[PDB]
Design a protein around this ligand. Structure first.
Ligand code: 4PV
Lengths: 264, 278
């Protein structure tokens, strides 16, 4: 245990109007979120270096993050029925965040609805960079099995050499959550889910006929077992499915519904 | 909200706790735990301060009526503002973690710690309490060698740390009973002879997989353990819950008969205090 974590800290007078939130506080001429509590160092380092509009802004540490008042995507997917135009809008935003991170040789390794925060204007931002991997030409692949079982790519689960396309798979599982309300095998135990991802491979939708052919194709490109065949974030940003995306304002009735449903 | 407040008034002791105890020092953050000293008697105490509400009334009443030498017992309770303070016993010899990471314990010392913990587990289980966190960090030592068990405090979310002490039935999210604490004691005994718990260099998710499949990992140096100690561990770390020993059965194990008196633990306390001074 070392103190070179004290070296990145900024060093009660800078922020006011503290109000406790979650299981994390809100404060203020901008509105901020302050999380008060070796991987914590990597998360602060990667967030400073990788600033983009589709990533929750790390502001300072003494951890001061920007505030997104519309909750997470989880509240929306578990309390509402999203249409394809809304799903395509969320997928486009996440792919813009992934295209940015991957070009900076960063693998998120934890893409899931819980890590997608929403703004009251419909803005979509990616968070939780604890599990991220910074790759390089000297070590372009990783092997560690990290992530949330239900969202993990089969190559991660089986501890094979993997790259940024593990995040593409996780995005594909997230789009399934947007359809079905839950990731595949959620009713199972996390270890039984790991076994199922490793053996079944590409998950099968409960009702595939409900989806348009263009959405089915988009998911097939995301959830392709052959990593070379699976699309990169840059390739999938050119997919026809994203062209049916509604403006980000279309997400605000969804935020309203989740807030109304979660009054307990 | 109101019924819980009135029920508390009849059970809490009158008097100002701020006048009764001194030298408050935070040791954890439901609520906050402070170490303190009784100004009148010199006793060292642990004070849990806190702002589900029906569950706490029963937990106090259980603690108050049920006493055991191998657990930190309930001493008193006070209503301080909108906070409830629960005063419990504490010990000055630190935790078992300091001893296992700074000294080499012999089997006679390990047996003495296992006997004390099993006496605490027998007591808790008869009171239909499953600890769930039996680990060296929750074992408190007294300057006379006394051993006391403490506590104090989702599939979508992330877990901080490897849950190395957890039984395979806990990991696989099955219904479970008090024998989960027996498994955890078995892991604690491994920590006592190797100086570390298993799955330390392992990722928490890889640890979960390993616990669920193989149960317990192979010992780093098994030839260093006596046959009677290896048998004791086999009974503790049995995958079949019915085959795994209960606290009452394991108190009759031959391994505990090689236990040295609790005075044999005081040189270990001295060494851990010397190692963790500066
Ligand atoms: C339902 N709820 C579970 C936790 N309980 C206890 N937990 C403990 C656990 C310890 F490790 C030390 C002391 C205690 N205090 C106790 C003292 C007597 C007793 F019978 C049980 C406990 C209280 C009841």
């Amino acid at each position: 245990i070392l103190e070179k974590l004290r070296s990145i800290v900024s060093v009660k007078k800078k922020y006011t109007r503290f109000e406790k939130i979650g299981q994390v506080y809100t404060a203020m001429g901008q509105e901020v979120a302050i999380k008060q509590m070796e991987l914590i160092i990597n998360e602060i380092l990667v967030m400073r270096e990788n600033k983009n509009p589709n990533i929750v802004n790390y502001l300072d540490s003494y951890v001061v993050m920007e505030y997104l008042a519309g909750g997470s995507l989880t509240d929306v997917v578990t309390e509402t029925c999203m249409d394809e135009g809304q799903i395509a809008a969320v997928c486009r935003e996440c792919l813009q965040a992934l295209e940015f991170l991957h070009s900076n040789q960063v693998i998120h390794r934890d893409i899931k609805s819980d890590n997608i925060l929403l703004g009251m204007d419909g803005s979509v931002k990616l968070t939780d960079f604890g599990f991220c991997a910074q790759i390089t030409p000297e070590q372009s692949k990783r092997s560690t099995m990290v992530g949330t079982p239900y969202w993990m790519a089969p190559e991660v689960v089986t501890r094979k050499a993997y790259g940024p396309k593990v995040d593409i798979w996780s995005l594909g599982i997230m789009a399934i959550e947007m359809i079905e309300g839950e990731p595949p095998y959620l009713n199972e135990n996390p270890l039984r889910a790991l076994y199922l991802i490793a053996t079944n491979g590409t998950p099968e939708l409960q009702n595939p006929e409900k989806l348009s052919a263009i959405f089915r194709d988009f998911l097939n490109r995301c959830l392709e077992m052959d990593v070379e065949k699976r699309g990169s974030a840059k390739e999938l940003l050119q997919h026809q499915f994203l062209k049916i995306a509604k403006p980000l304002s279309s997400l605000t009735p969804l935020i309203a519904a989740a807030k109304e449903a979660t009054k307990n």
